[PDB]
Amino acid sequence: TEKDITIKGKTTSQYLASVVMGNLPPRPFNIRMRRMTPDSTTDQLQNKT
């Protein structure tokens, strides 16, 4: 894991946030992301990333 992210706000607008990292490893590589909050089950929750 290179970096974590947590958001604890309340909004209904599409909010975009930028996070930077320093690329120490050389050579072309791959980058991935994983969501820890489980997917929505009902329509009452819509936290989509």
């Binding site: 947590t6 604890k8 706000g9 930028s18 996070v19 930077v20």
Partner: protein, 89 residues
């Protein structure tokens, strides 16, 4: 042969002052009306100038002073200095 017309000049030099015969005396700057009534210093620049006409200056001790700005740029910052502590709310 002979070398006439010595024409001693000890009197002429004093005509401009005697303290100048041992010290060249410090130069003085001019006064700009636009810069109110402030007096410009010849050895300090508190204001931060623009890196272009002004030659690369030199420092010789103390003197919190300005600079010659080379690049000014304003952008959008990141949320988090580093580490894993990246909370927002």
């Amino acid at each position: 042969g002979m070398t006439g017309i010595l024409f001693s000049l000890g009197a002429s030099m004093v005509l401009g002052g005697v303290a100048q015969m041992l010290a060249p005396k410090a130069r003085t700057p001019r006064i700009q009306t636009t810069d109110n009534g402030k007096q410009n210093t010849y050895f300090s620049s508190l204001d931060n100038m623009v890196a272009q006409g002004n030659v690369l200056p030199v420092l010789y001790g103390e003197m919190r002073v300005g600079s010659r700005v080379v690049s000014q740029e304003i952008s959008t910052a990141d949320e988090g200095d580093g580490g894993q502590v990246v909370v927002i709310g």
